[PDB]
Amino acid sequence: ISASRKLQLKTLLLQIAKQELEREAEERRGEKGRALSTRCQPLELAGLGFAELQDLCRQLHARVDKVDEERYDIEAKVTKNITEIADLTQKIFDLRGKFKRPTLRRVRISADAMMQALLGARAKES
Amino acid sequence: DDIYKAAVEQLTEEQKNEFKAAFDIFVLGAEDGCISTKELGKVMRMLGQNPTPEELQEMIDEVDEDGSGTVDFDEFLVMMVRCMKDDSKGKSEEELSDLFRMFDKNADGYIDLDELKIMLQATGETITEDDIEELMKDGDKNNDGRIDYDEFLEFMKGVE
Amino acid sequence: DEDETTALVCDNGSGLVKAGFAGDDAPRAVFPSIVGRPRHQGVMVGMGQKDSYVGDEAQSKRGILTLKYPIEHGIITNWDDMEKIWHHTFYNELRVAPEEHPTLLTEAPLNPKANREKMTQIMFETFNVPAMYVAIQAVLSLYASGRTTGIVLDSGDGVTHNVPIYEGYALPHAIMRLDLAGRDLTDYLMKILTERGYSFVTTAEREIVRDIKEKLCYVALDFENEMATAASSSSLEKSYELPDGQVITIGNERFRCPETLFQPSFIGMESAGIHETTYNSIMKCDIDIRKDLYANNVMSGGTTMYPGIADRMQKEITALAPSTMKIKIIAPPERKYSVWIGGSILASLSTFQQMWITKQEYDEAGPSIVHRKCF
Amino acid sequence: DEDETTALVCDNGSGLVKAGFAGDDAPRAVFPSIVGRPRHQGVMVGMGQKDSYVGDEAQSKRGILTLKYPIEHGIITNWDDMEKIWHHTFYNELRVAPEEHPTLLTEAPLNPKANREKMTQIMFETFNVPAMYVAIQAVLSLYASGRTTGIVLDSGDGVTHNVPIYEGYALPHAIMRLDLAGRDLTDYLMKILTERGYSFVTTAEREIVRDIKEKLCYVALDFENEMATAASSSSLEKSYELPDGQVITIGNERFRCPETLFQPSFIGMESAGIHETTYNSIMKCDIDIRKDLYANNVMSGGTTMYPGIADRMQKEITALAPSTMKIKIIAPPERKYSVWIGGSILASLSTFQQMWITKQEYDEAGPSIVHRKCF
């Protein structure tokens, strides 16, 4: 496989993985909307009586406590896996590192500036 | 060593003939008629700068896939479009995780050849098994037959 | 003309100043740390003529100038002259105004605090730099050399620092700073050249002896065996052409001058040499550290540009070290320039973005801030 | 990575931690009971470097760390460090979330009750273990050794417990608890190695002496004869290599360290030694118990690995014992590890499945439940 072919292959692959990221994320987000409608179901407020609405607010406040607690547990776990990602990426990055160091140069006189400092007016596309 | 050909695929040919004449003066007074150390040196000198023959011979070898050791005029044009700003930006680990969860449809932490094959067939470009094969092999430095996630960083390091 | 608002880096030593931009390969220009001034009465008028010359200007017109060095033994003592070197460095060769660019300067951890305070103050008050950092030359040497662990033997123009670093941590009580450096080796050579019939006393003569040393001297992996032949035969002499057409040669003095690094008593210094300091820095570190420092002696800076030094040092430390243990030396081609190289690496790291002193922090705290935030 | 929700078993002593899964033959991982912390100022930028290191991490990076043991003579006082040891053990090496598996921890019955209450609490309140069971090390020692009856001789790194068990029942009035253990034996060795010219005081040095003891020390059947011989000949000297290439040659210190178990005055302890207490544990039991305990003197835990210990203990008990009676010592290869094995055996017994405290009975009763459900 020659040069431009491989360039196009891999850049189009990156686009394909982007599109699969898109489909996976839209799956996740439709799932979110549907699951949220499913769990926390909209209230039925019409015509509800006074003391009725008092006790209902209390029960839904217990519901606040439950759901908040539970999502917050998912949150704490996520934070633990966050520290896990940070520190394991740190770890491996170091194992990756000690030689991984990506850097830039500037000893590269770019062919625009190069060919102009050479050609003057003749460096028209150069 | 090839991305420069890929960039001239994106670039024009008038620059190729300007570099033909370039190479000609780049060997103005040459010992080998191609760009050895001192030829690239007098290139930099006409550029107004003074290089060292080590990096000279190195940029000579920076394209050296076969071990050609020299600057063929073809390899010369390669080296000269190396310095034009054509494709940049060095794609890497983060977006590569974002894309590797996909490229690892198997979610192995390693792109098996299944996902790579399918997503290439999806790339829209013609898909050879030289494509998918070289891509698996360059990804997989552990050569497990599956492109590890960091082997996928390798797989999509910089390829604009 | 630059494509990024990057940091600037300048290794301002007692010898030369290596200057360029952070994120680039090397320094754009290297200047002598010299401000030159005329020592003669003018006769012609309308001849231009400066009150003072800087860097390469000072050397180019040196025939009638006395040349002074604003930095000695790692410390700036003449802040006015360094401001002049910097104005020239930044605006004439790097083509940058520091007003829009964070600037990194370097020192040894055992230089007086005044060095770091004046470096910071000049850039914030005469150049209005948006940010400053004063770096450790040993750290910069380790980044350039690919190490986090080892002994950095910087062997500079005015001072040798000798500091152990392990896993990125300093072992500061084990720093064996030595009052022996390249500038003393030059003065030693001037005296031995005088014994050979070639006296040098004035600035032009002093700059040439330094140039002679840099091109003709070497250390030798084994000075005794080198002397047995060098002291017996003219085949070991090397010629140097003086600016005025005279020729000076050096015989065993060619390695006996550099030998001072292994014999400081040659210049009146109370020391056994750099290998003793390397060894003691390892000795003062814990036993589970020592194994890694023996395997990682790091040469950086100039004066390490003497053939035979990597091997001379390995033999000299191995001789003091325990048996079984492997003693190893790192001595990259990025010698003498490795501190600048490390400067560019450090200034541009994402992990270093919060290490910078901003102008606002400086203006609120004053120059003593460098002592608290840099290291 | 385990295919069943079996009990996790972890024997956490003042020295090492043995961790694995119940029903198996050996711990899957062994960690020191250590949390390490850097004692130096960082110099380089972007070096990573942890705030604390645990278990094998603590020893691996120890060159610049101070190493602390959370357990003091058998009791955990530092629970911040132990939750790190447990988290690391479970999460990284046993590859288990305790939430899905019951856990067995161990301790002597005379260990302050606060420790078994807290061991029960850490697994229920930090790791959410579905159930708990704190085991008696002597119980586990006899299961591993194939006994129901015998004396458990368990001098460890922390303390010595000395407990007789008959037909599975403890005879608690006969327990002879001593503040005599490997940590003190090690301290004595550091003092006597200092007498020989090798002074060891820092964490790296303290770990070296502990390592010297484990590899070089022994007791010998006859102490007077071994002493007189060591004092007369170099034939009893043994060398040890240190991390930096240093070598230490050790003579009678090789057995004077272990000797403290028989001569506690060496460490300032008011005790007649482990053989007096092993003997008294048998003696304090009824005469129809004693015959079976004499014939089943069982070693478990470490220090039992010193050559000559099974024979010296059998001889000293025999010398103290009535004649006619047969005294025998069991000192299996499953030494130093047999308690873990006993843990595996107990956790998995069908007759033990009702002994587990669930995270319900625990929550309703509180921490004190361990005193009623375990021991």
User: Are B10 and B3 a contacting pair, CB within 8 Å?
Assistant: no
Q: What is the three-class DSSP state of D56?
A: helix
Q: What is the three-class DSSP state of D19?
A: strand
Q: What is the DSSP letter of C11?
A: E
**Is the CB of residue A124 less than 8 Å away from at least one CB of chain C?**
no
Q: Return the partners of chain D (3 or more C-beta pairs < 8 Å).
A: A, C
Do C149 and C284 lie in one domain? The reply is yes
Is there a contact between C287 and D242 if contact means CB atoms under 8 Å apart? yes
Count of Cβ atoms closer than 10 Å to residue C344 Cβ: 29
**Is the CB of residue A102 less than 8 Å away from at least one CB of chain C?**
no
With a CB cutoff of 8 Å and minimum separation 6, the contacts of A33 are: none
Q: How close does chain C come to D158, measured CA to CA in Å?
A: 25
Is there a contact between C25 and A98 if contact means CB atoms under 8 Å apart? no
- List the one residue out of B149, B156, B106 whose CA is nearest residue B135: B156
Q: What order do you get walking across the sheet with C329-330 strand by strand? A: C169-170, C163-166, C150-153, C297-299, C329-330
Nearest to D47 among C167, C321, C323 (CB): C167
Chains B/D: 3 or more C-beta pairs closer than 8 A? no
**Composition of chain C by helix, strand, coil, percent to 5:** 40, 20, 40
Strand partners, B68: none
Could you tell me how far CA C345 lies from the centroid of its own chain? 18
Q: What is the three-class DSSP state of D152?
A: strand
Determine which helix (DSSP H) or strand (DSSP E) holds A4, and give its type and residue range.
helix A3-39
Q: What is the DSSP letter of D122?
A: I
Q: Which of C44, C68, C92 is the last residue of a domain?
A: C68
Mutate to test the interface with B, among A11, A14, A27, A105 (most CBs of B within 10 A): A14
With a CB cutoff of 8 Å and minimum separation 6, the contacts of D342 are: D135, D137, D139, D140, D141, D142, D143, D144, D300
Domain CATH code at residue C233: 3.90.640.10
- List the one residue out of C105, C174, C142 whose CA is nearest residue C338: C142
Q: A73: exposed, middle or buried (C-beta count within 10 Å: 0-12, 13-18, 19+)?
A: exposed
List Cα–Cα distances, D266 to A101, B15, C21, D271, D279, in angstroms.
Answer: 55, 89, 66, 10, 21
CA atoms within 13 A on the CB side of D124: 25
Is there a contact between A8 and B123 if contact means CB atoms under 8 Å apart? yes
**Is the CB of residue A11 less than 8 Å away from at least one CB of chain D?**
no
User: Are D90 and D175 a contacting pair, CB within 8 Å?
Assistant: no
Do C11 and C130 lie in one domain? The reply is yes
Contacts of B156 in chain A (CB under 8 A): 10, 13-14
Q: Count Cβ neighbours within 10 Å for each residue of B15-45 and write b for 16 or more, e otherwise.
A: beebbeebbeebbeebeeebbbbbbbbbbbe
Chains A/C: 3 or more C-beta pairs closer than 8 A? yes
What is the C-alpha R_g of chain C?
21
Supply φ then ψ for residue C343, to 5 degrees. -60, -50
Do C278 and C149 lie in one domain? The reply is yes
Do C251 and C176 lie in one domain? The reply is no
- The DSSP line for C51-67 is S-EETHHHHHTGGGEEE
Q: What order do you get walking across the sheet with C357-358 strand by strand? A: C29-32, C16-21, C8-12, C103-107, C131-136, C357-358
- List the one residue out of C272, C270, C329, C275 whose CA is nearest residue C299: C329
Cβ-based interface (< 8 Å): residues of C facing A: 21, 23-26, 146, 148, 345, 348
Contacts of D56 in chain A (CB under 8 A): none
Q: B4: exposed, middle or buried (C-beta count within 10 Å: 0-12, 13-18, 19+)?
A: buried
Q: What is the DSSP letter of D70?
A: S
User: Are C58 and C65 a contacting pair, CB within 8 Å?
Assistant: yes
Strand partners, D153: D299
- List the one residue out of D2, D69, D65, D4 whose CA is nearest residue D31: D69
Contacts of A104 in chain B (CB under 8 A): none
- How was this structure determined? It was done by cryo-EM
Is there a contact between B123 and A117 if contact means CB atoms under 8 Å apart? no
Domain CATH code at residue C112: 3.30.420.40
- List the one residue out of C168, C278, A125, D167 whose CA is nearest residue B15: A125
The tokens for B97 are: 């995780």
Do C257 and C278 lie in one domain? The reply is no
- List the one residue out of A125, A121, A9 whose CA is nearest residue B8: A125
Resolution rounded to one decimal, in angstroms:
7.8
The tokens for C64 are: 């009638």
What is the DSSP pairing of strand D247-250 with strand D238-241? Answer: antiparallel
The C-alpha atoms of residue D139 and residue D300 are separated, in whole angstroms, by: 11
Is there a contact between A106 and C148 if contact means CB atoms under 8 Å apart? no
With a CB cutoff of 8 Å and minimum separation 6, the contacts of B152 are: B96, B100, B103, B104, B111, B139
The tokens for C142 are: 């380790």
List Cα–Cα distances, C262 to C51, C155, C210, C294, C359, in angstroms.
Answer: 42, 12, 19, 18, 44
Q: C105: exposed, middle or buried (C-beta count within 10 Å: 0-12, 13-18, 19+)?
A: buried
Q: What is the 3-state secondary structure (H, E, C) of D166-233?
A: ECCEECHHHCCCECCCHHHHHHHHHHHHHHCCCCCCCHHHHHHHHHHHHHHCCCCCCHHHHHHHHCCC
Q: Which of D219, D242, D267 is the last residue of a domain?
A: D267
User: Are D282 and D327 a contacting pair, CB within 8 Å?
Assistant: no
Is there a contact between A99 and C146 if contact means CB atoms under 8 Å apart? yes
Do C93 and C143 lie in one domain? The reply is no
With a CB cutoff of 8 Å and minimum separation 6, the contacts of C109 are: C136, C138, C161, C163, C170, C172, C175, C375
- The DSSP line for C171-206 is -GGG---BS--HHHHHHHHHHHHHHTT----SHHHH
**Is the CB of residue A107 less than 8 Å away from at least one CB of chain C?**
yes
Q: What is the three-class DSSP state of A94?
A: helix
Q: What is the three-class DSSP state of D281?
A: helix
Chains A/D: 3 or more C-beta pairs closer than 8 A? yes
Contacts of A11 in chain B (CB under 8 A): 159-160
Range of the domain at C57: 35-68
The tokens for D133 are: 């069971």
- List the one residue out of D299, D348, D366, D362 whose CA is nearest residue D135: D348
- List the one residue out of D352, D370, D353, D351 whose CA is nearest residue D361: D370
Strand partners, D297: D151, D329
Domains in chain D, number: 4
Is there a contact between A3 and B9 if contact means CB atoms under 8 Å apart? yes
Is there a contact between D242 and C172 if contact means CB atoms under 8 Å apart? no
Strand partners, C164: C151
**Is the CB of residue A5 less than 8 Å away from at least one CB of chain C?**
no
**Is the CB of residue A81 less than 8 Å away from at least one CB of chain D?**
no
User: Are D150 and D122 a contacting pair, CB within 8 Å?
Assistant: no
With a CB cutoff of 8 Å and minimum separation 6, the contacts of B16 are: B8, B77
The tokens for D354 are: 């009702």
Within chain D, where are the H helices? 56-60, 79-88, 113-121, 137-145, 182-195, 203-216, 223-230, 253-259, 274-283, 287-294, 309-320, 338-347, 361-365, 370-373
Total residue count of chain C as it appears in this document: 375
Q: What is the three-class DSSP state of D110?
A: coil
Contacts of D50 in chain A (CB under 8 A): 87
Q: What is the three-class DSSP state of D270?
A: coil
Size of interface C-D (CB pairs under 8 A): 90
The C-alpha atoms of residue C206 and residue D372 are separated, in whole angstroms, by: 91
The tokens for C11 are: 């290794």
Which of 26-65 (A) contact D at CB < 8 A?
A: none
User: What residue of A is the nearest CA neighbor of D91?
Assistant: A84
**Is the CB of residue D42 less than 8 Å away from at least one CB of chain C?**
yes
Do C84 and C127 lie in one domain? The reply is yes
Q: Count Cβ neighbours within 10 Å for each residue of C27-49 and write b for 16 or more, e otherwise.
A: bbbbbbbbbbeeeeeeeeeeeee
Strand partners, D135: D106
Domain CATH code at residue D48: 2.30.36.70
Strand partners, C71: C76
Q: How close does chain D come to C138, measured CA to CA in Å?
A: 9
Report the first-to-last Cα separation within chain B, whole angstroms: 14
Count of Cβ atoms closer than 10 Å to residue A82 Cβ: 11
Could you give the angle at the alpha carbon of D167 between the alpha carbons of D166 and D169, nearest 5°? 65
Do C160 and C150 lie in one domain? The reply is yes
The C-alpha atoms of residue A58 and residue A47 are separated, in whole angstroms, by: 18
Count of Cβ atoms closer than 10 Å to residue B123 Cβ: 20
Q: D1: exposed, middle or buried (C-beta count within 10 Å: 0-12, 13-18, 19+)?
A: exposed
Nearest to D47 among C168, C288, C289 (CB): C168
* Amino acid of residue C158: G
The tokens for A59 are: 């029960």
Contacts of B10 in chain A (CB under 8 A): 4
Do D257 and D160 lie in one domain? The reply is no
User: What residue of D is the nearest CA neighbor of A94?
Assistant: D48
Q: What is the 3-state secondary structure (H, E, C) of chain B?
A: CCHHHHHHHHCCCHHHHHHHHHHHHHCCCCCCCCCCHHHHHHHHHHCCCCCCHHHHHHHHHCCCCCCCCCCCHHHHHHHHHCCCCCCCCCCCHHHHHHHHHHHCCCCCCEEEHHHHHHHHHHHCCCCCHHHHHHHHHHHCCCCCCEEEHHHHHHHCCCCC
Could you give the angle at the alpha carbon of B46 between the alpha carbons of B40 and B52, nearest 5°? 40
The C-alpha atoms of residue D33 and residue D18 are separated, in whole angstroms, by: 10
The C-alpha atoms of residue D106 and residue C15 are separated, in whole angstroms, by: 67
Q: What order do you get walking across the sheet with D29-32 strand by strand? A: D29-32, D16-21, D8-12, D103-106, D131-135, D357-358
- List the one residue out of C48, C62, C274, C83 whose CA is nearest residue C161: C274
With a CB cutoff of 8 Å and minimum separation 6, the contacts of D38 are: C169, D49, D51, D64, D65
The tokens for D4 are: 């069943």
What is the DSSP pairing of strand C53-54 with strand D297-299? Answer: unpaired
User: Are D211 and D189 a contacting pair, CB within 8 Å?
Assistant: no
> What is the number of helices (H) and of strands (E) in chain D?
14, 18
User: What residue of D is the nearest CA neighbor of A97?
Assistant: D47
- List the one residue out of C165, C140, C136 whose CA is nearest residue C150: C165
> What is the number of helices (H) and of strands (E) in chain A?
3, 0
Is there a contact between A5 and B126 if contact means CB atoms under 8 Å apart? yes
What is the DSSP pairing of strand D103-106 with strand D75-76? Answer: unpaired
Contacts of D246 in chain C (CB under 8 A): 287, 322
State the Cα torsion C178-C181-C184-C188 to the nearest 10°: 100
Determine which helix (DSSP H) or strand (DSSP E) holds D76, and give its type and residue range.
strand D75-76
Chains C/D: 3 or more C-beta pairs closer than 8 A? yes
Is there a contact between D45 and C139 if contact means CB atoms under 8 Å apart? yes
The tokens for C278 are: 């390397």
Is there a contact between A105 and C24 if contact means CB atoms under 8 Å apart? yes
Nearest to B120 among A13, A115, A125 (CB): A13
The C-alpha atoms of residue C26 and residue D124 are separated, in whole angstroms, by: 59
User: Are D328 and D182 a contacting pair, CB within 8 Å?
Assistant: no
The C-alpha atoms of residue D156 and residue D300 are separated, in whole angstroms, by: 9
Strand partners, D16: D32
The C-alpha atoms of residue D81 and residue D75 are separated, in whole angstroms, by: 13
The C-alpha atoms of residue D275 and residue D289 are separated, in whole angstroms, by: 19
State the Cα torsion B77-B81-B87-B92 to the nearest 10°: 70
Do C276 and C358 lie in one domain? The reply is no
Contacts of A102 in chain B (CB under 8 A): 90
Q: Return the partners of chain B (3 or more C-beta pairs < 8 Å).
A: A
What is the C-alpha R_g of chain B?
19
Mutate to test the interface with C, among A106, A108, A112 (most CBs of C within 10 A): A106
Contacts of D48 in chain A (CB under 8 A): 90-91, 93-94, 97
Report the first-to-last Cα separation within chain A, whole angstroms: 29
- List the one residue out of B50, B17, B43 whose CA is nearest residue A118: B43
State the Cα torsion D361-D367-D371-D375 to the nearest 10°: 80
List Cα–Cα distances, D207 to A68, C274, D200, D241, in angstroms.
Answer: 49, 32, 9, 13
**Is the CB of residue A83 less than 8 Å away from at least one CB of chain D?**
no
Could you give the angle at the alpha carbon of A81 between the alpha carbons of A75 and A86, nearest 5°? 125
The C-alpha atoms of residue D310 and residue D331 are separated, in whole angstroms, by: 7
Could you tell me how far CA D276 lies from the centroid of its own chain? 20
**Is the CB of residue C136 less than 8 Å away from at least one CB of chain D?**
yes
Do C129 and C24 lie in one domain? The reply is yes
The C-alpha atoms of residue C238 and residue A89 are separated, in whole angstroms, by: 56
The C-alpha atoms of residue C265 and residue B33 are separated, in whole angstroms, by: 56
Could you tell me how far CA C355 lies from the centroid of its own chain? 24
Supply φ then ψ for residue C296, to 5 degrees. -140, 65
Contacts of C146 in chain A (CB under 8 A): 98-99
Do D115 and D28 lie in one domain? The reply is yes
- List the one residue out of C137, C95, C119 whose CA is nearest residue C341: C137
Q: How close does chain B come to A96, measured CA to CA in Å?
A: 10
